[PDB]
Amino acid sequence: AFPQPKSDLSILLLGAGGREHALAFKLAQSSRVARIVVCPGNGGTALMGGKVSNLALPWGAPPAFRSIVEWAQKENIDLVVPGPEQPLVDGVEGAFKKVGIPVFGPSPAAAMLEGSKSLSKEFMARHNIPTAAFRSFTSTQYEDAVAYIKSKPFTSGRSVIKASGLGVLIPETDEEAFAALKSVMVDKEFGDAGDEVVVEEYLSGPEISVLAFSDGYTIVPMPAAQDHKRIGEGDTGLNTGGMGAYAPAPIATKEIMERCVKDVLEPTIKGMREDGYPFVGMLFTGFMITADGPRVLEYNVRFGDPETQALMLLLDEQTDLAEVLLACVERRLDSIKLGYKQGYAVSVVLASEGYPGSYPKGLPMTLNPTPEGVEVFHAGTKRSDNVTVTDGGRVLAVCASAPTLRAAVDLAYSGISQISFQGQTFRRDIAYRAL
């Protein structure tokens, strides 16, 4: 008979956000996992203990990543799960591939779905994937980019200027568009990311997040989620990396989800094989549900934050997340158990004073026992001399699941009362527009 599946695995998580803590949270429950390493991790992972440990080590500059690749090789790491976008787009998968350590994530080429907006938009058009009308330009084509706006190409009358590299501007009028083109192509306020620019139609409608596991052939979606990008209540103010999320998003009806899967996800996975670079890992597709149907705003090639903190709470207790991740890199996703419990899940972010602007770091945090069904996943936190202190803009996320969305919302906000740090900020209306 075939050998027993190794049940003392060592997994290396790259990153230090709440996505990592939430992933470490689930992976640590697998009976097939004996060691979880979070590089660098944060104050939350630092307190888990047991199988989880933080590794304060640099990754090393791309494309080699020699520091962490050599460390992983000497430690017999069985799997690497990159969280952030930069290492994937920079090619961390190829670095670990050269030492025979598998990676839950896309190859350097497949990662271009998020690394190059220009390539991603071309990919969508070539495969008839519904997205906003667009035209891509290089930094030297600044003259053409101006003429393109001067011709009024978009029916909506508004354009979106995106820097292809690792960022997005929405000029309310043409005047702001011409200025936004010189700030990215001439002055290059975003660096090399502005070497190419995407100009596409501004679309109106609510947004949803669809996360799906992929092994290059099989793709298994998770319940659709919705995120709150803006800092101010009522969906106003400057944008952030995400102040809170919930799932399943009621707006993603059976018919809507069928369209996303059949018209985007599966054509995307098939298209990547046809183009010669199959996609393995977590495909995060950001949709806008317009009056004419779903539209792909952007591809993200890894777990989302804070969508993951909520979705991890919807994995049924029969699902082993470790088994799911290995089934993806081993190309057997269609032959494993993977289900989702009933009810809803919510994540509410606590941020530092000033975020998304300038904020101070290092404030001591008071963390009292949270209600029974509340899970606190740390993002920008750190341990220092037996005390957890803030260490980033988004500090942590208070998350909960429950049979009803309102109960999950109320439970999450119940855990907020047990957390306190100077200048803590959060939105009180997470998931309000769905209740």
Side-chain angles (χ1 to χ4, degrees), residues 253-381:
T253 64
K254 180 179 178 295
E255 299 83 350
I256 297 291
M257 279 296 289
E258 189 66 16
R259 302 260 67 181
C260 293
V261 172
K262 291 300 199 69
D263 304 356
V264 174
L265 275 55
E266 288 173 350
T268 294
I269 297 302
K270 183 192 297 183
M272 292 297 281
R273 290 203 309 278
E274 294 171 333
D275 289 356
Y277 302 95
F279 182 91
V280 180
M282 164 46 58
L283 180 69
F284 178 108
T285 308
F287 293 87
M288 178 170 290
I289 306 304
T290 74
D292 294 3
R295 298 292 181 273
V296 177
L297 295 181
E298 61 185 17
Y299 288 118
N300 289 18
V301 299
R302 34 59 181 181
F303 281 103
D305 192 311
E307 287 95 348
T308 299
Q309 293 90 304
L311 288 168
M312 290 298 98
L313 278 47
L314 292 181
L315 288 171
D316 62 55
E317 300 304 347
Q318 208 74 2
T319 295
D320 180 325
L321 182 53
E323 186 62 57
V324 172
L325 300 178
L326 283 173
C328 287
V329 304
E330 295 177 2
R331 320 314 170 93
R332 36 181 274 273
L333 176 59
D334 72 326
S335 299
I336 60 172
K337 295 187 179 182
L338 196 172
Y340 310 106
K341 58 187 274 185
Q342 305 183 41
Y344 301 79
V346 181
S347 61
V348 177
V349 171
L350 261 58
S352 298
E353 181 179 353
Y355 180 86
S358 57
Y359 59 87
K361 301 190 299 182
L363 287 304
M365 298 171 58
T366 305
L367 304 165
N368 298 311
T370 63
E372 184 177 357
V374 176
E375 294 297 340
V376 180
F377 300 121
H378 298 210
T381 67

Side-chain angles (χ1 to χ4, degrees), residues 85-381:
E85 175 195 0
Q86 182 166 305
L88 288 173
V89 171
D90 287 355
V92 68
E93 190 265 0
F96 282 102
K97 185 177 184 296
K98 295 172 181 179
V99 292
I101 297 174
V103 170
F104 178 80
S107 67
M112 299 181 81
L113 285 177
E114 188 182 349
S116 168
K117 300 181 184 300
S118 61
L119 178 156
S120 71
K121 298 288 293 190
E122 183 194 353
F123 173 91
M124 297 172 197
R126 173 169 64 263
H127 297 288
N128 284 324
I129 298 163
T131 188
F134 76 95
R135 285 301 305 114
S136 293
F137 303 87
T138 62
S139 58
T140 60
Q141 298 174 331
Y142 168 76
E143 293 286 1
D144 298 318
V146 171
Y148 181 68
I149 298 174
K150 183 181 173 181
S151 62
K152 299 292 191 300
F154 300 143
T155 303
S156 298
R158 300 187 60 178
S159 300
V160 185
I161 301 178
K162 298 182 178 181
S164 63
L166 313 195
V168 175
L169 292 175
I170 306 178
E172 298 191 11
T173 62
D174 290 11
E175 294 303 344
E176 306 185 16
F178 309 116
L181 291 181
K182 171 171 294 182
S183 58
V184 181
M185 307 180 69
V186 175
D187 299 80
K188 305 230 295 179
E189 295 181 358
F190 297 89
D192 57 330
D195 294 2
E196 295 174 346
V197 62
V198 169
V199 182
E200 63 181 34
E201 184 176 2
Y202 174 88
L203 301 180
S204 301
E207 300 183 26
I208 62 172
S209 298
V210 180
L211 289 72
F213 299 93
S214 173
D215 75 356
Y217 271 102
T218 301
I219 179 164
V220 178
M222 308 186 82
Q226 282 190 277
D227 179 46
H228 292 265
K229 294 178 175 180
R230 290 166 176 270
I231 188 68
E233 296 182 349
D235 303 89
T236 56
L238 285 67
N239 292 268
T240 71
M243 291 300 300
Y246 53 95
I251 193 171
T253 64
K254 180 179 178 295
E255 299 83 350
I256 297 291
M257 279 296 289
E258 189 66 16
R259 302 260 67 181
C260 293
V261 172
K262 291 300 199 69
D263 304 356
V264 174
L265 275 55
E266 288 173 350
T268 294
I269 297 302
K270 183 192 297 183
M272 292 297 281
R273 290 203 309 278
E274 294 171 333
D275 289 356
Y277 302 95
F279 182 91
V280 180
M282 164 46 58
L283 180 69
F284 178 108
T285 308
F287 293 87
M288 178 170 290
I289 306 304
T290 74
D292 294 3
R295 298 292 181 273
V296 177
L297 295 181
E298 61 185 17
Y299 288 118
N300 289 18
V301 299
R302 34 59 181 181
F303 281 103
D305 192 311
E307 287 95 348
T308 299
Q309 293 90 304
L311 288 168
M312 290 298 98
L313 278 47
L314 292 181
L315 288 171
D316 62 55
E317 300 304 347
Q318 208 74 2
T319 295
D320 180 325
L321 182 53
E323 186 62 57
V324 172
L325 300 178
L326 283 173
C328 287
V329 304
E330 295 177 2
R331 320 314 170 93
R332 36 181 274 273
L333 176 59
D334 72 326
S335 299
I336 60 172
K337 295 187 179 182
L338 196 172
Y340 310 106
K341 58 187 274 185
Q342 305 183 41
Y344 301 79
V346 181
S347 61
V348 177
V349 171
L350 261 58
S352 298
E353 181 179 353
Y355 180 86
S358 57
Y359 59 87
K361 301 190 299 182
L363 287 304
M365 298 171 58
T366 305
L367 304 165
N368 298 311
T370 63
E372 184 177 357
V374 176
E375 294 297 340
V376 180
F377 300 121
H378 298 210
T381 67

Side-chain angles (χ1 to χ4, degrees), residues 6-11 24 26-37 51-52 78-79 320-323 326:
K6 204 58 155 51
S7 56
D8 56 332
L9 296 168
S10 296
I11 295 170
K26 294 299 302 186
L27 296 175
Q29 295 177 318
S30 161
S31 62
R32 291 179 44 73
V33 172
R35 184 184 185 189
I36 289 282
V37 177
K51 308 174 181 174
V52 176
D78 302 301
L79 178 68
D320 180 325
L321 182 53
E323 186 62 57
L326 283 173

